[PDB]
């Protein structure tokens, strides 16, 4: 109810970022956690002031006249809390870690806030040994994602003085699992007009919510997990992927939620894993986060001396879909250097 308006803005941010990725890497796999990316940037905004702060939340899709800064902060705090609330049969955890340089002067308020309100672990980190620091952070992310996100950080700047990381791990079982005895070992999957790859193809005949969107010329299939989560598969008609991508929005999701109807489907779904990485520094800059990178960055709410600025950002996310369910994880990295 109160979360919905925010999650909807978060969804339109997800689709806008998705469309930037389709320009960066056309006709290629895309996979990311929008909630991870949004949550990491809102955390950074908690210590920002003035235009540095407003640029971040506006880039995330918020209108400050509609949703005041304090409301955005409270909302995201409530969102993280709700997502982490234990739900039987569902593994879902989203958390943050702050790796603070030995000589940093973080404000006691910033630290207590993130720890108490934003599921944050704080670690005193010696960045003078940059190789060891990078390994500590990568290993932490690896642990918190149940081993699924390995080597998040490829390079760490030698003058790094703070790193903020967000992680998400998700593991769920299908409401109606596939029988591996009905999985075809090797089936064709079209990757371009003249080329197929072979994948195992799972097969079941069950009642699912589904629709054909008559305007967008795509099939939409909902597959429930056993509690509090679902997967939506969107299968455009031949030649329609670009137009469907253009149309993806919270408005479109609301339309589909009304139109979905449960009935029998003879369903074939591939068993597969993929992984994706994104260097987000320049993308976030293009999207409107400018002052955070500048020599006049205003993070006066974070450290005593306003002594840092954003230098780099990256995301990695992984997916596996099989007969039992789905396991996915992601992590976001934000690097800071002296201002």
């Amino acid at each position: 109810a109160t979360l919905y308006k925010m999650s909807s803005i978060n969804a339109d941010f997800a689709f806008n970022l998705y469309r930037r990725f389709t320009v960066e890497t056309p006709d290629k796999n895309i996979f990311f956690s929008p909630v991870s990316i949004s949550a990491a940037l809102v955390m950074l905004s908690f210590g920002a002031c003035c235009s540095t702060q407003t640029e971040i939340v506006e880039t995330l899709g918020f209108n400050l006249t509609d949703t005041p800064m304090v409301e955005i902060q409270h909302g995201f705090q409530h969102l993280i809390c709700s997502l982490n609330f234990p739900k039987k049969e569902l593994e879902l955890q989203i958390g943050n870690a702050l790796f603070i340089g030995k000589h940093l002067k973080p404000l006691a308020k910033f630290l207590n806030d993130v720890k108490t309100l934003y599921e944050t672990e704080v670690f005193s980190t010696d960045f003078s040994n940059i190789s060891a620091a990078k390994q500590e952070i990568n290993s932490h992310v690896e642990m918190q994602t149940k081993g699924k996100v390995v080597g998040l950080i490829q390079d760490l700047k030698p003058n790094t003085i703070m790193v903020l990381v967000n992680y998400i791990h998700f593991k769920a079982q299908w409401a109606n699992p596939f029988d591996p005895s009905k999985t075809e070992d090797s089936s064709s999957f079209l990757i371009d007009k003249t080329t197929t790859v072979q994948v195992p193809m799972m097969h079941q005949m069950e009642q699912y919510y589904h629709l054909v969107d008559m305007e967008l010329n795509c099939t939409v299939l909902q597959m429930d997990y056993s509690k509090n989560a679902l997967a939506l598969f969107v299968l455009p008609k031949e030649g329609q992927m670009e137009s469907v991508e253009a149309a993806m929005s919270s408005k479109t999701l609301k339309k589909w939620n009304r139109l979905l109807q449960k009935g029998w489907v003879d369903l074939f779904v591939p068993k597969f894993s993929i992984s994706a990485t994104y260097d987000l520094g320049a993308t976030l800059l293009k999207m409107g986060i400018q002052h955070a990178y500048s020599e006049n960055a205003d993070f006066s709410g974070l450290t005593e001396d306003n002594g840092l600025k954003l230098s780099n950002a990256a995301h990695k996310a992984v997916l596996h879909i099989g007969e039992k369910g789905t396991e996915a994880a992601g992590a976001m990295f934000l690097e800071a250097i002296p201002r």
């Binding site: 979360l3 998705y18 929008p34 989560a229 969107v234 455009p236 009935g263 074939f268």
Partner: protein
């Protein structure tokens, strides 16, 4: 019954119900990409 065969490029969303959050979003073009 209608057949739905996910045997070519598709988009995928993983949603959490209680908050209506998109946890993951993607497009699968080549499911065997390393």
């Amino acid at each position: 019954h209608p057949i739905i065969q996910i045997d070519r490029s598709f988009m995928l969303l993983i949603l959490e119900r209680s908050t209506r959050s998109i946890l993951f979003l993607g497009k699968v073009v080549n499911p065997t990409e390393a």
